[PDB]
Amino acid sequence: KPHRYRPGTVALREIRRYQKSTELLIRKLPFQRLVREIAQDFKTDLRFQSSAVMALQEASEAYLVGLFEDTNLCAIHAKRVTIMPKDIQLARRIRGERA
Amino acid sequence: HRYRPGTVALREIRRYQKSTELLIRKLPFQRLVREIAQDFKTDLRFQSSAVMALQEASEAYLVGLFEDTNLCAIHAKRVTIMPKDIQLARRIRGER
Amino acid sequence: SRKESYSIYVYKVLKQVHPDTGISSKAMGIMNSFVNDIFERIAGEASRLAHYNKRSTITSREIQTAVRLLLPGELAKHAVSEGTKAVTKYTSA
Amino acid sequence: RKESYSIYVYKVLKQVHPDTGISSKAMGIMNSFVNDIFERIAGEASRLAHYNKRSTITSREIQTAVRLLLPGELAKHAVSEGTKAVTKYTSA
Amino acid sequence: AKTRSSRAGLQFPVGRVHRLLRKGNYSERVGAGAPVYLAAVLEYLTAEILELAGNAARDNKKTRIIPRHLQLAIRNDEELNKLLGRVTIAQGGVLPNIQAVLLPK
Amino acid sequence: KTRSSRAGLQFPVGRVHRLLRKGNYSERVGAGAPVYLAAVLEYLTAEILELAGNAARDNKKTRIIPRHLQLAIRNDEELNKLLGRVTIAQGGVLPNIQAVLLPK
Amino acid sequence: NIQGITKPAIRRLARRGGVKRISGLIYEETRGVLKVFLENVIRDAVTYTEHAKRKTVTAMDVVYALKRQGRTLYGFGG
Amino acid sequence: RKVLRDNIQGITKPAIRRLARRGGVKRISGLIYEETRGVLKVFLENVIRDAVTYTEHAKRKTVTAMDVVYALKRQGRTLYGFGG
DNA sequence: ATCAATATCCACCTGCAGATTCTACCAAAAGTGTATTTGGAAACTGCTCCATCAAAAGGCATGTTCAGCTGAATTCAGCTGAACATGCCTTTTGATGGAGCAGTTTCCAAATACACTTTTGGTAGAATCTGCAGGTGGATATTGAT
DNA sequence: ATCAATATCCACCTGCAGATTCTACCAAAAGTGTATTTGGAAACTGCTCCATCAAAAGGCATGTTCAGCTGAATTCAGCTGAACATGCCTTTTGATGGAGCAGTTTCCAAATACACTTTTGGTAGAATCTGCAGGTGGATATTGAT
Ligand SMILES: [Cl-]
Ligand SMILES: [Cl-]
Ligand SMILES: [Mn+2]
Ligand SMILES: [Mn+2]
Ligand SMILES: [Mn+2]
Ligand SMILES: [Mn+2]
Ligand SMILES: [Mn+2]
Ligand SMILES: [Mn+2]
Ligand SMILES: [Mn+2]
Ligand SMILES: [Mn+2]
């Protein structure tokens, strides 16, 4: 036509896709570097078992997905469809993660 | 003389945030507690400090819940708390 | 190096409820974490109970109260059933 | 008969504020507080020793427990006080 | 030689659970019935989860329970979901759930 | 000649030791553990009474009441985090009105 | 019994939580919330009562119930 | 090994988008990506700090899965599947 | 009210990585005997807690009035989604060197055990003395009329 | 904007009641001295498994364009919820008797710990079995431009 889906159709297509699957959604190597940089500032010369890095990525991705669910409810509560930083701060605040 | 809507409400917020007295009348609360306890175990007695502990906890819980409800109302560009505000707060807290 | 786990017992119970069904080792690891988690929650709650009541012994009575305190509703009723049944059957020699 | 920390909470209050007293209810609140933090540190100490297959809770477990439970500056000063008390106790 | 599990009618190991109660500093003494009761409850809750996850594995036309099936079984059951409300299942994903307000008008 | 004085403390080293032995925490308990633990308890108690003494004279009373303890806990960032899921009975709350609620 | 918890008293609680304006459906919603709270805590406290073979719910029973529920309370023996 | 810098930027915009999709989000404002990086970094600091404390207490130089599990549990973020 | 475009679903197919069964040793359950503890069962105390009582203040229920908040309607600048070219950098699979868990042995600084002595902390009255309940009168703020 | 009128904080008394503090006595717990055992640190070493690299390939991040439609701004009026007066009933306060029951003893019969000895279920590993991942089709919705 050239064919072109309308804004929102692919986003809903991706919600369905990623809610069916369980694969980690952050790239592995970059995340492992993030973990070692943060650990390196706490204690130098640390080593990691590889399952210790996977445990952190599994926990970090479940936290963020969960946070994004609550963020979405706060956006929809404000009569929006778009998540904004104020939504994350409201969710984090009601969870007791921030004063 | 007639104060405009909200002026007395703000005055009450300052009054009650300044104080620490229990804000629910004692005998209704005690009657409600005994009723609820009856649905789990019969001919129960209560220490009076047991009931005061429940009332202290129940009021601190509800006051805290009204703070999060209020933030959810402000977030929706309102000044009035509505049931959906309470419901959102309880959803994010994991109580639902 | 010899590492205990609950895997053979989980697998037996799996065969009971689904004779045709198996389990990936990752799912076994989730089941092992489950068993150990509920163990510590029940045992810990039973440890507190015995302590509040100035008792030096954790008995089936402490286990049962802990179970009531920890499991929601129907899950508690049924666990208490199985638990009471196993104890009476155990004591009957 | 019925132990509590009132006597020691009062001794610390005079050290920091000789002029000041404390009400019955506020004393009960400090007793709750001491018992709470005690069980938090002791339980954490308990799990540390178990995770590491040790049967003894030593001041080293107490310190790691304090590091895990207190948030930042509270942790630094608490670790200093405990370290001091163990030193002074050992010396004489 | 009769195992305490067979005496109690249980698949879970009463003797191991007893040792685990003793070595865990839970109390100075452990009654003979506590490991039996506890091992039965652990067996029961395990059977409860395996039943529901087996079913999910069959709805998905699969012969082998994977973590995903454990998640579906837990999060779709109100009481298991409450019990495991503060738990993460590695490789579990989430439940399919799109807020109505977001579906096309 | 008590262990408290030997460690230079007001809090009871001897009692903390007994409570550790009898609390089902571990088979054994080192000698310095009750000392170290007694010292942390005395420090956190001194910290709270420090600030709550202040809250009480900032209000013209000799006597610390629960309201003063609540004001001290909640106006201090680190004590508030430590006591984040704790209710001080008769403590009330911190005065606080959202900006958007105020007049004009 | 639950309507013993009156509208003026719910307003007072909301006030202490900084609320300025209150919708009319709030009071019944608040009573239901308070009822779930009291059910959950009292169920647990009474379990501590029955386990100790007692007919009297003690302050300590409530204290322990509130700790279990993540609602630690200071001032009542714990 | 080369020195590690700025690795929170390896948490890319498309990876955050994907996470938000699994969380049900349809539309994402432009400023969400750096908020998420800030939130994720706070999260990892708190857990890694606790994990390394367990490592150092055991006198090891190697963070183990168990260290991460005990740290997750303390933060109220219990994790199943890595109990070894 | 129909059709091109595109994504999504659904079968079948197979061999290989991942699960299941096999196997043989052995760590830790079970059996036995015996030394030690416990906690339910008896008869008690002396309380707190419940139950009427009963009169009375002040907190609540109610009806009136209208200020102003909420949400419905409308408009539109520009942010964010969709699509695409481009090419960087993650992923996968082995290699290998060695750091450092983890497994054993040795043996002692430090823990427990126990009998007895000293001192502390709980308690419950006597002897203070703080702060609550009222007054008031000025500070400060709100609301109407200009 | 300011002046006038009304209403509400809130700083400051006083004279008690009650709640703290102050004293003295005494069992129960902490300390002590002396003897004896033992967890776990230190040293030593086997051998996982972690860090690091290499290379090839293509899955995926990035940057750009373009405009659909979302959020933000604005107006407005219906009507909900705030303020307030008034009449009343539920809570508060008091007391007073009695009883339901904690809480406490002293207790043995039952139950539990613990050292030795023997039996076997459970684990590590190699041997075997096999779902299903990851391809390759078309069959079926599903979406969006006319
Ligand atoms: Cl038993
Ligand atoms: Cl020590
Ligand atoms: Mn660095
Ligand atoms: Mn004394
Ligand atoms: Mn007054
Ligand atoms: Mn040894
Ligand atoms: Mn819009
Ligand atoms: Mn109008
Ligand atoms: Mn065999
Ligand atoms: Mn497939």
mmCIF file of C-alpha atoms in Angstrom, chain C residues 4-6 9-10 12-14 16-18 20-24 26-27 30-31 34-35 37-44 47 56-60 63-64 67 70-75 78-80 82-84 86-87 89-90 93, chain E residues 4 6-13 16-17 19-21 25-34 36-38 40-51 54-55 58 63-67 70 79-80 82-84 87 89-90:
data_model
loop_
_atom_site.group_PDB
_atom_site.id
_atom_site.type_symbol
_atom_site.label_atom_id
_atom_site.label_comp_id
_atom_site.label_asym_id
_atom_site.label_seq_id
_atom_site.Cartn_x
_atom_site.Cartn_y
_atom_site.Cartn_z
ATOM 1 C CA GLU C 4 20.384 -33.835 49.797
ATOM 2 C CA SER C 5 17.191 -32.567 48.231
ATOM 3 C CA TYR C 6 13.477 -33.275 48.117
ATOM 4 C CA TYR C 9 9.817 -37.313 47.042
ATOM 5 C CA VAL C 10 8.469 -34.599 44.759
ATOM 6 C CA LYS C 12 6.850 -39.752 43.746
ATOM 7 C CA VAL C 13 3.993 -37.337 44.538
ATOM 8 C CA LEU C 14 4.043 -36.206 40.880
ATOM 9 C CA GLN C 16 0.655 -40.184 42.168
ATOM 10 C CA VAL C 17 -1.321 -37.185 40.914
ATOM 11 C CA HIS C 18 -0.243 -37.384 37.249
ATOM 12 C CA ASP C 20 1.794 -39.717 32.714
ATOM 13 C CA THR C 21 3.551 -36.412 33.575
ATOM 14 C CA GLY C 22 7.225 -35.523 34.131
ATOM 15 C CA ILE C 23 9.182 -32.467 35.237
ATOM 16 C CA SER C 24 12.125 -30.413 33.931
ATOM 17 C CA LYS C 26 14.395 -26.253 36.525
ATOM 18 C CA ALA C 27 10.863 -26.995 37.678
ATOM 19 C CA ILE C 30 11.390 -24.418 41.990
ATOM 20 C CA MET C 31 9.643 -27.256 43.869
ATOM 21 C CA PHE C 34 8.997 -24.292 47.672
ATOM 22 C CA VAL C 35 9.359 -27.210 50.132
ATOM 23 C CA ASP C 37 10.493 -22.179 52.129
ATOM 24 C CA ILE C 38 7.268 -23.620 53.661
ATOM 25 C CA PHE C 39 9.382 -25.757 56.010
ATOM 26 C CA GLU C 40 11.154 -22.705 57.470
ATOM 27 C CA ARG C 41 7.946 -20.652 57.696
ATOM 28 C CA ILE C 42 6.117 -23.409 59.567
ATOM 29 C CA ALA C 43 9.075 -24.368 61.746
ATOM 30 C CA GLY C 44 9.881 -20.722 62.508
ATOM 31 C CA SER C 47 9.442 -21.982 67.234
ATOM 32 C CA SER C 56 10.812 -26.225 75.421
ATOM 33 C CA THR C 57 9.331 -28.730 72.938
ATOM 34 C CA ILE C 58 7.919 -28.336 69.439
ATOM 35 C CA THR C 59 5.063 -30.850 69.201
ATOM 36 C CA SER C 60 2.486 -31.627 66.555
ATOM 37 C CA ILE C 63 2.980 -27.506 63.961
ATOM 38 C CA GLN C 64 -0.797 -27.423 63.595
ATOM 39 C CA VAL C 67 -0.200 -24.262 59.804
ATOM 40 C CA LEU C 70 0.322 -19.582 57.761
ATOM 41 C CA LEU C 71 -2.041 -21.128 55.265
ATOM 42 C CA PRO C 72 -5.044 -19.319 53.790
ATOM 43 C CA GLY C 73 -8.492 -20.841 54.356
ATOM 44 C CA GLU C 74 -9.213 -24.055 52.494
ATOM 45 C CA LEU C 75 -5.500 -24.868 52.166
ATOM 46 C CA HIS C 78 -6.934 -29.734 54.105
ATOM 47 C CA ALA C 79 -3.336 -29.609 55.411
ATOM 48 C CA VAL C 80 -4.625 -30.044 59.002
ATOM 49 C CA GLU C 82 -3.580 -34.747 56.203
ATOM 50 C CA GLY C 83 -1.410 -33.810 59.185
ATOM 51 C CA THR C 84 -3.850 -35.127 61.800
ATOM 52 C CA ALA C 86 -0.653 -39.036 59.461
ATOM 53 C CA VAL C 87 -0.064 -38.499 63.185
ATOM 54 C CA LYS C 89 -1.865 -43.379 61.902
ATOM 55 C CA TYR C 90 1.764 -43.041 63.055
ATOM 56 C CA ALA C 93 2.046 -48.328 65.692
ATOM 57 C CA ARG E 4 8.709 -43.623 60.000
ATOM 58 C CA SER E 6 5.819 -45.862 55.939
ATOM 59 C CA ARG E 7 4.437 -45.967 59.480
ATOM 60 C CA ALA E 8 2.758 -42.614 58.843
ATOM 61 C CA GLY E 9 1.534 -43.436 55.335
ATOM 62 C CA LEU E 10 3.729 -40.728 53.762
ATOM 63 C CA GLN E 11 5.962 -40.283 50.700
ATOM 64 C CA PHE E 12 7.864 -37.409 52.300
ATOM 65 C CA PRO E 13 10.725 -38.379 54.652
ATOM 66 C CA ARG E 16 14.980 -36.271 57.405
ATOM 67 C CA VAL E 17 12.380 -33.714 58.537
ATOM 68 C CA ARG E 19 16.739 -34.190 61.773
ATOM 69 C CA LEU E 20 16.046 -30.876 60.026
ATOM 70 C CA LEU E 21 13.946 -29.737 63.005
ATOM 71 C CA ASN E 25 17.650 -24.523 66.571
ATOM 72 C CA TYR E 26 13.896 -24.279 66.618
ATOM 73 C CA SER E 27 13.447 -25.549 70.209
ATOM 74 C CA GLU E 28 15.378 -27.629 72.682
ATOM 75 C CA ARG E 29 13.176 -30.737 72.150
ATOM 76 C CA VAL E 30 11.143 -32.080 69.225
ATOM 77 C CA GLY E 31 8.145 -34.322 69.759
ATOM 78 C CA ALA E 32 7.781 -37.571 67.877
ATOM 79 C CA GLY E 33 4.696 -36.259 66.096
ATOM 80 C CA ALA E 34 6.031 -32.914 64.856
ATOM 81 C CA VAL E 36 5.169 -36.541 60.955
ATOM 82 C CA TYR E 37 2.705 -33.636 60.923
ATOM 83 C CA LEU E 38 5.124 -31.297 59.107
ATOM 84 C CA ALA E 40 2.505 -34.551 55.769
ATOM 85 C CA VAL E 41 1.662 -30.848 55.249
ATOM 86 C CA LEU E 42 4.705 -30.414 52.985
ATOM 87 C CA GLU E 43 3.610 -33.478 51.004
ATOM 88 C CA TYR E 44 0.036 -32.174 50.761
ATOM 89 C CA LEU E 45 0.972 -28.720 49.497
ATOM 90 C CA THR E 46 3.381 -30.292 46.970
ATOM 91 C CA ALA E 47 0.578 -32.542 45.670
ATOM 92 C CA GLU E 48 -1.689 -29.494 45.430
ATOM 93 C CA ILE E 49 0.786 -27.587 43.244
ATOM 94 C CA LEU E 50 1.746 -30.583 41.084
ATOM 95 C CA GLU E 51 -1.932 -31.320 40.412
ATOM 96 C CA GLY E 54 0.098 -30.962 35.590
ATOM 97 C CA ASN E 55 -3.230 -29.600 34.313
ATOM 98 C CA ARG E 58 -1.832 -30.646 29.598
ATOM 99 C CA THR E 63 4.106 -33.930 28.900
ATOM 100 C CA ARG E 64 6.681 -32.226 31.146
ATOM 101 C CA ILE E 65 5.959 -29.588 33.816
ATOM 102 C CA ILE E 66 8.164 -26.525 33.287
ATOM 103 C CA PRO E 67 8.425 -23.433 35.594
ATOM 104 C CA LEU E 70 4.092 -23.802 38.038
ATOM 105 C CA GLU E 79 -5.056 -19.382 47.850
ATOM 106 C CA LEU E 80 -1.741 -20.535 46.377
ATOM 107 C CA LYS E 82 -1.818 -15.570 48.510
ATOM 108 C CA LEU E 83 0.594 -18.040 50.122
ATOM 109 C CA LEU E 84 3.255 -17.289 47.476
ATOM 110 C CA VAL E 87 7.669 -15.138 45.890
ATOM 111 C CA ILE E 89 9.301 -18.119 40.189
ATOM 112 C CA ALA E 90 12.359 -17.943 38.005
#
